[PDB]
Design a protein around this ligand. Sequence first.
Ligand SMILES: *C/C=C(C)/C=C/C=C(C)/C=C/C1=C(C)CCCC1(C)C
Ligand SMILES: *C/C=C(C)/C=C/C=C(C)/C=C/C1=C(C)CCCC1(C)C
Ligand SMILES: *C/C=C(C)/C=C/C=C(C)/C=C/C1=C(C)CCCC1(C)C
Ligand SMILES: CCCCCCCC/C=C/C(=O)OC[C@@H](O)CO
Ligand SMILES: CCCCCCCC/C=C/C(=O)OC[C@@H](O)CO
Ligand SMILES: CCCCCCCC/C=C/C(=O)OC[C@@H](O)CO
Ligand SMILES: CCCCCCCC/C=C/C(=O)OC[C@@H](O)CO
Ligand SMILES: CCCCCCCC/C=C/C(=O)OC[C@@H](O)CO
Ligand SMILES: CCCCCCCC/C=C/C(=O)OC[C@@H](O)CO
Ligand SMILES: CCCCCCCC/C=C/C(=O)OC[C@@H](O)CO
Ligand SMILES: CCCCCCCC/C=C/C(=O)OC[C@@H](O)CO
Ligand SMILES: CCCCCCCC/C=C/C(=O)OC[C@@H](O)CO
Ligand SMILES: CCCCCCCC/C=C/C(=O)OC[C@@H](O)CO
Ligand SMILES: CCCCCCCC/C=C/C(=O)OC[C@@H](O)CO
Ligand SMILES: CCCCCCCC/C=C/C(=O)OC[C@@H](O)CO
Ligand SMILES: CCCCCCCC/C=C\C(=O)OC[C@@H](O)CO
Lengths: 229, 232, 232
Amino acid sequence: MVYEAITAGGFGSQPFILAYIITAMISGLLFLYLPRKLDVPQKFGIIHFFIVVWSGLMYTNFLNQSFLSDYAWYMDWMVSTPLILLALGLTAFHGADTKRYDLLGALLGAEFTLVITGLLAQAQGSITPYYVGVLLLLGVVYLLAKPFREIAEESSDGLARAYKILAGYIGIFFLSYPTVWYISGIDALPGSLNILDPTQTSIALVVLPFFCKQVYGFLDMYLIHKAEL
Amino acid sequence: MVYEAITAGGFGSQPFILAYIITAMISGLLFLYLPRKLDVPQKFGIIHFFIVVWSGLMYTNFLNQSFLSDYAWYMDWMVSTPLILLALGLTAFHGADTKRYDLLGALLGAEFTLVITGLLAQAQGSITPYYVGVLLLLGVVYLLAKPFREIAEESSDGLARAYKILAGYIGIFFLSYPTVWYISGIDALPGSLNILDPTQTSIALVVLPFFCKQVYGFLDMYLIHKAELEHH
Amino acid sequence: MVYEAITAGGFGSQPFILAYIITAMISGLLFLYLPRKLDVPQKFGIIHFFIVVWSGLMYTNFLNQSFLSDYAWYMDWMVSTPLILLALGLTAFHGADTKRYDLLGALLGAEFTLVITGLLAQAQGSITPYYVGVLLLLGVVYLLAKPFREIAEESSDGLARAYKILAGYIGIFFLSYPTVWYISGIDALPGSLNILDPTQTSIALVVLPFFCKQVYGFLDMYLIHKAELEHH
Ligand SMILES: *C/C=C(C)/C=C/C=C(C)/C=C/C1=C(C)CCCC1(C)C
Ligand SMILES: *C/C=C(C)/C=C/C=C(C)/C=C/C1=C(C)CCCC1(C)C
Ligand SMILES: *C/C=C(C)/C=C/C=C(C)/C=C/C1=C(C)CCCC1(C)C
Ligand SMILES: CCCCCCCC/C=C/C(=O)OC[C@@H](O)CO
Ligand SMILES: CCCCCCCC/C=C/C(=O)OC[C@@H](O)CO
Ligand SMILES: CCCCCCCC/C=C/C(=O)OC[C@@H](O)CO
Ligand SMILES: CCCCCCCC/C=C/C(=O)OC[C@@H](O)CO
Ligand SMILES: CCCCCCCC/C=C/C(=O)OC[C@@H](O)CO
Ligand SMILES: CCCCCCCC/C=C/C(=O)OC[C@@H](O)CO
Ligand SMILES: CCCCCCCC/C=C/C(=O)OC[C@@H](O)CO
Ligand SMILES: CCCCCCCC/C=C/C(=O)OC[C@@H](O)CO
Ligand SMILES: CCCCCCCC/C=C/C(=O)OC[C@@H](O)CO
Ligand SMILES: CCCCCCCC/C=C/C(=O)OC[C@@H](O)CO
Ligand SMILES: CCCCCCCC/C=C/C(=O)OC[C@@H](O)CO
Ligand SMILES: CCCCCCCC/C=C/C(=O)OC[C@@H](O)CO
Ligand SMILES: CCCCCCCC/C=C\C(=O)OC[C@@H](O)CO
């Protein structure tokens, strides 16, 4: 019952969720427009567009109650967060000699499952899946830190630096998510610490996404342009 | 309460829906068969097979109530309408030199998001997401209309003509759905106009699909066949 | 009412469901490591990792009631069993000249659709969709038995033998599922027959998946390995 907890009484988080949704939409447009002017491949503009627009659309379930609303987080991250890791995977490939799409799939597949464990954690009211999720996230991080790093180092010195920058960014932001999820004291969530109240929890999982999507998109695409100079 | 409305009173749409399903299943079997007879790549038979068989299976939720029924259309279009666009895209690729698979993804991705907006709108009884869906639709027809057209025009004249025909056929039909959705007077479906009664909506929503899937299946495969015969 | 029936009273399947999840997680870790030890392509490890881990996860919904619980088998096979087939397909492709990724798509799509029929059947309380599934599954067996077999025979004798063994293994086992599903006396799923009680059904759908996931991942990677050893 995440939704009722988030929107009962004040629903203080709604200004933030509204602002997220709008900055998402306008960012999505800008992302489509950018790579025309920017000298980065279109696939990046496109991917970030979907990251941000999919996220936006899902968060509308907090403004308007549907059957989705209690799980709108996992509906969003389901497809947003693998697209993020795809953006990050393809950047690494960009200049490089050997592309490795089996690793892309692993990268993306882990994220998806990771996010489904959250889904499962909450629905079950049980933390067991959450632990499996965290192990997977470590697996993602490993994947980013090593194999994809190496592939990125095959290419130009600028791009490899760009990857490292993006990867550590995305790495560390990702690790925050299971944190605020665990320490949330929303009754539904089986996190056994209770530090953040529903509105706080909700607001964290608006600001955090903002950095991981809206900023990420620009960060990714400016960094690839600025490398290829 | 889309299902509830649709099966209200007589349930007038009942037998149309049944004929759509039966018909889908038979189309499917042909689609698997045709390519071998037709000198068209098997991949095309396979895509149309799933399109027409997926749709048919989802529509059985109007004949037997389930937790899916209210959102059946979306459960269908979710995977059917990107497959439709995959065929169209792959047709454009068929005889061309440069293949843009990131554009294929954008094409297919937009459709999926664009059907999910439809689902969101009904689920929150809210019209907002629909507008984004409409914006995405226009991105789809733009994609089809230009980049994919460009790629199509590297190929022989017949294959370019084929794409151009199918691209208009599916583009025009595709714009009808958000129309009759908005137009519909089922209450679950938001938007102000209530022009179409639930049975009229339902019947619009098996007629258009019959043209987008069954007819489209054959049309695609015959245009690709006629173009390759014309150029050999 | 699937969860309630299974877990009601003694919940006699809970140990098997536990033993299954624990072995799945452990098998998964091993699958990731095995490829580097066997000179088998890492991708096979990846795919088998996800098969057991995803399956394991979905089965936690029998240990803890959720909205997914009643439909957990479908949520599992919905992605697990296309992956099982991806592995089969890629095995066949492994030594071969022609990679036909449309057959891979057809293989995977039939499976996924074929699981969704099971979910529709339960959700509808109707046996109709089950029947489409069975057809579809005979589509799958067909694919495996022929075109995929031909592509395997393109390769070395060791690789070709590997595929045919696995294809047999997995074919036979895949047929058992629509059988147990049908004869199961869980009220929710609409077989005419009521031979198994929920616990027996549950046990069967623990032990059979053990052989199709945990065992199969090892079997697949060792057969390839062996095969690659046999030809310098
Ligand atoms: C834009 C949103 C982003 C970048 C979300 C990232 C979310 C995660 C990495 C969540 C991870 C989780 C676990 C590792 C365990 C289960 C709970 C989750 C879903 C928060
Ligand atoms: C076989 C069925 C087909 C080809 C259906 C096409 C359906 C659409 C293009 C629906 C479009 C919609 C929007 C663009 C926004 C409103 C919601 C939808 C799904 C009606
Ligand atoms: C690891 C689990 C596996 C390999 C499960 C296989 C499951 C099936 C082949 C199920 C088949 C079905 C039909 C053919 C029709 C009715 C619905 C199903 C899912 C029982
Ligand atoms: C849905 C949860 C994960 C399911 C899929 C994740 C793993 C799929 C990756 C398959 C793979 O690596 O094979 C592709 C390889 O042949 C590309 O060359
Ligand atoms: C944690 C979820 C799955 C992790 C994927 C494990 C794959 C790691 C293997 C890397 C790879 O094969 O790249 C080659 C490099 O390790 C040595 O050449
Ligand atoms: C090759 C063309 C085959 C067309 C077959 C469509 C026939 C479907 C008609 C069903 C019908 O009218 O019965 C519906 C109603 O009686 C069910 O209760
Ligand atoms: C692609 C498959 C072509 C058509 C397959 C569906 C035919 C099976 C029909 C089953 C049926 O109608 O039985 C339903 C009855 O037992 C319950 O009302
Ligand atoms: C399941 C609902 C969407 C179906 C997606 C399955 C196909 C998606 C992408 C396939 C494609 O791009 O085929 C060509 C690919 O092998 C690139 O070489
Ligand atoms: C549900 C929202 C997701 C829509 C599809 C997400 C990805 C669409 C585009 C993928 C892409 O650009 O991959 C192309 C790349 O693999 C070319 O090498
Ligand atoms: C409501 C939206 C429907 C309008 C779409 C019709 C597009 C048909 C015209 C395409 C065109 O002008 O492309 C010509 C190209 O050579 C210009 O770069
Ligand atoms: C490779 C083995 C890794 C860990 C296996 C542990 C499974 C055995 C644990 C059985 C247990 O918890 O029995 C508790 C019982 O008394 C509760 O009824
Ligand atoms: C993704 C294509 C269709 C699969 C639908 C996935 C939904 C599975 C879960 C359904 C559910 O939670 O409804 C069951 C219960 O809440 C209603 O009795
Ligand atoms: C229920 C969802 C079923 C989706 C399965 C449709 C996948 C069949 C598409 C074949 C494909 O994209 O092959 C591409 C490759 O052959 C291009 O050369
Ligand atoms: C590969 C070994 C298969 C293991 C099957 C799992 C056992 C499930 C119990 C079945 C059962 O006892 O059916 C017999 C009885 O219900 C029929 O009268
Ligand atoms: C949790 C552990 C599950 C136990 C299953 C592992 C046994 C699978 C059998 C592997 C095998 O015999 O491969 C060797 C054979 O193919 C010749 O190399
Ligand atoms: C394993 C799940 C894969 C994708 C299915 C997503 C499930 C749909 C999201 C939540 C939902 O269906 O809500 C159903 C019920 O909890 C409403 O209260």
